[PDB]
Design a protein around this ligand. Structure first.
Ligand SMILES: OC[C@H]1O[C@H](O[C@H]2[C@@H](O)[C@H](O)[C@@H](CO)O[C@@H]2O)[C@@H](O)[C@@H](O)[C@@H]1O
Ligand SMILES: OC[C@H]1O[C@H](O[C@H]2[C@@H](O)[C@H](O)[C@@H](CO)O[C@@H]2O)[C@@H](O)[C@@H](O)[C@@H]1O
Ligand SMILES: OC[C@H]1O[C@H](O[C@H]2[C@@H](O)[C@H](O)[C@@H](CO)O[C@@H]2O)[C@@H](O)[C@@H](O)[C@@H]1O
Ligand SMILES: OC[C@H]1O[C@H](O[C@H]2[C@@H](O)[C@H](O)[C@@H](CO)O[C@@H]2O)[C@@H](O)[C@@H](O)[C@@H]1O
Ligand SMILES: [Ca+2]
Ligand SMILES: [Ca+2]
Ligand SMILES: [Ca+2]
Ligand SMILES: [Ca+2]
Ligand SMILES: [Mn+2]
Ligand SMILES: [Mn+2]
Ligand SMILES: [Mn+2]
Ligand SMILES: [Mn+2]
Lengths: 237, 237, 237, 237
């Protein structure tokens, strides 16, 4: 199977697979059953911002999700990504819907990764910033139901011609270039990601969520990973 | 054939195809026969720096090449890249040797491209920076004789186990992700590239040169493009 | 007197001092009487974006001003800033009102300057980005009527408690640190600035405008420079 | 007195004030008696690199110091800078010598700070990068014995016309613009700094060290702070 590290923005409480009984953010290390979660007051129809950070000095993956004028939700987990991911990865966004549904609309996405050796200063970096998505956007790999360009946004899951979100949908967008996330003899490595999103739904209990993820380069949507599996995992183990 | 825009650092005067009678820098728009050149005092065995810039307001492709303590060489050409390149491209470095030879060693390479629409501020960007090259560097497409990792450098053309450069060699490195270089309704677009290089040779007249280039995404080394064709063109038309 | 280079967004046609008979953008080199202008269709009450660029290879100061869905206004002028400005400068925004008036509200302001020598690669840079202004924002020098913090914006000229703009107002904001804009032996130098703005007015002919400017470090608002002088010049020479 | 947070690169073991018995790196929060230290194998005459990082999610100040081909030294301390520093600060480098001495030569210094509110995305940033220092470098405040420009370097402490370091010296360089390091309602704030340095000495036990520091805006060298006090503190409390 793929190898996945992710930050989930999980809108739907699947208590039969260990979710808490409320919408939540979580750190997922090789399982949908998050290693750490925090309560998240998702605001239906408002634009939110997610920030994700990591560095190899502290070996701590952290995320903060906010809406204007409200308390943020923050979650952190101590993990050494050298012990989890391959050296080269792709980074992406994923989302899903199930019985219940929501738009999984990405309005912007930026990412930076740095890798520094002990040679003097000698540091490599990748940075991208999408504030407008186009169709046929050749620097993204779209998987499943994801589309780009409608109103300049990335729609990870299916929406009808008028903006009604559909159930049983899954889609992802991966940046085209591989990213060098760690190296045996690097002095320091770090990354950060930010995205803004609009989750809107007619349902009183929207579903299923959005995730930022890091995977093996050749990662693909696992069969059946709509709904609670967020396009990331083949099962709930 | 491919579509190529390039800045050549041309070490060898091929006067039978229109080169001036001295080493030179040049702007190449769909032909090896440069649209503009400037005299270049290449310094055998020293580390040089090349800077390339362009923006869609001025529609001027410019380059400056320097060595410490010496005068720089600068060349500029008015060209609207919308009229030459496809919207999506790859960017790369190319080099060659022929009867005469030189190392075509790249010590660093950075690139930034920005594309801004009239939506408020709404600007997309790509930036990469390689100050150390690794082997099996998955964010580069290596073509021909190019290799990475030896002493942390990118060797575009063949060098023997002790650093002796070989004749009749050609090689290129392209960044893996496509780059969005223009768009129909962009307000402004720009790019810049910088690389540092070490051209060393036992020959009194080193050959053939290094180029930074922008091409169709699927560009490959044209058959026979060693020597004076710099890995870029199939012929000298 | 101060030494000023500026890009003016001039909302009011002062034909008695050489303005064209329409709102316009202009390049001002040591005089309010622009060296080059272009027609500008300012949209009362809409958010606009201004981009300004310059580099020492091309020696061309260019600006583009846009509103969503409309044609942009662009102006360019060939000038070598080594011949006009001191080596060290401050950068800022200025605005004014006169008999007629408008809000001169800055929603965001970013700036980057780079200066590279021929030492290998050896390049210095300054970048700032304000997307929210606070009061008592210690990295800005506010002059005249300019205030910060109201709704997170920079109000260059006076606005009443309800947002009504006032006449006969002038104000400026300068970044606190001096900027090294050129050097005798630099290989390349460049800068860019971007700001977003909201000019709104009850008048059918709003006045007077906004400018991005570069000045001697100790620049101050010239006496009497409300109105057509944009907070920049002591007279219309 | 001033308020100081610093990362010390302490070359001389002052065991009478709590230093360990070896050269060390340390995190100093309002005292020269570090809250955390790590052993540091300083290499006389070699160029080292220091990296310092902090973010408000994790509230952890960390530093890593390296020389090519050797193990790095790393130290970290959990501290919420909101509880220690004023909202607005200056950032700087400091160094000293005493009875024993060393060059405290800075070859490069970069810094980035970001402050993001919950307004959508709305983030402010400052970045500077000095790879060459000039004299009369107007974006630095030099204090004490610090000078700039000799061979393009920043010499924090006194060196004779031939490069012999002098005892009983202290000097600092602060970036001119204040930095907004925290805010009451920010969602996330972060900073990073990197510098490269050359500490060379004729002494078998070089002294006293270099520090990166963050202080009240109006900070000045405390009287008598040569030697073990690193230009930072008035006493060893
Ligand atoms: O979209 C929400 C949720 O919907 C579906 O799950 C619901 C139901 O169909 C299941 O039988 C029960 C028990 O597992 O859970 C729900 O009530 C699935 O599509 C699921 O993946 C998704 O999270
Ligand atoms: O590497 C320099 C140069 O070498 C070869 O060209 C030389 C010779 O072989 C040719 O007959 C003449 C006339 O075209 O030019 C040279 O002297 C080629 O490999 C060439 O592509 C290359 O530039
Ligand atoms: O704010 C617009 C304009 O208003 C004032 O100028 C007007 C008038 O008072 C002057 O007598 C005439 C002739 O110069 O021009 C205007 O109609 C001034 O405040 C001026 O600076 C400003 O641009
Ligand atoms: O530069 C090293 C060190 O030198 C001086 O301290 C030495 C000596 O003069 C003192 O009497 C003893 C006891 O405190 O310590 C040293 O051996 C001072 O300049 C000191 O600040 C500095 O670290
Ligand atoms: Ca769930
Ligand atoms: Ca040639
Ligand atoms: Ca006017
Ligand atoms: Ca000490
Ligand atoms: Mn969950
Ligand atoms: Mn040529
Ligand atoms: Mn005018
Ligand atoms: Mn100590």
């Amino acid at each position: 199977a793929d190898t996945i590290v992710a930050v989930e923005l999980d809108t739907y409480p699947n208590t039969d697979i260990g979710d808490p009984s409320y919408p939540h953010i979580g750190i997922d290390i090789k399982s949908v059953r998050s290693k750490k979660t925090a309560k998240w007051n998702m605001q239906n129809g408002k634009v939110g911002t997610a920030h994700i950070i990591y560095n190899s000095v502290d070996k701590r993956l952290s995320a903060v999700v906010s809406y204007p004028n409200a308390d943020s939700a923050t979650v952190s987990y101590d993990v050494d990504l050298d012990n989890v991911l391959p050296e080269w990865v792709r980074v992406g966004l994923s989302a899903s819907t199930g019985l219940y549904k929501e738009t999984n609309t990405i309005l912007s996405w930026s990412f930076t990764s740095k890798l520094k050796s002990n040679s003097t200063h000698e540091t490599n970096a990748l940075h991208f910033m999408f504030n407008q998505f186009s169709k046929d956007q050749k620097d993204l790999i779209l998987q499943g139901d994801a589309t780009t360009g409608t109103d300049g946004n990335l729609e990870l899951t299916r929406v009808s011609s008028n903006g009604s979100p559909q159930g049983s949908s899954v889609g992802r967008a991966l940046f085209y270039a591989p990213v060098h996330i760690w190296e045996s003899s690097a002095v320091v490595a770090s990354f950060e990601a930010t995205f803004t999103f609009l989750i809107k739904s007619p349902d009183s209990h929207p579903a299923d969520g959005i995730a930022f993820f890091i995977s093996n380069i050749d990662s693909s949507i696992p069969s059946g990973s709509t709904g609670r599996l967020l396009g990331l995992f083949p099962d709930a183990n």
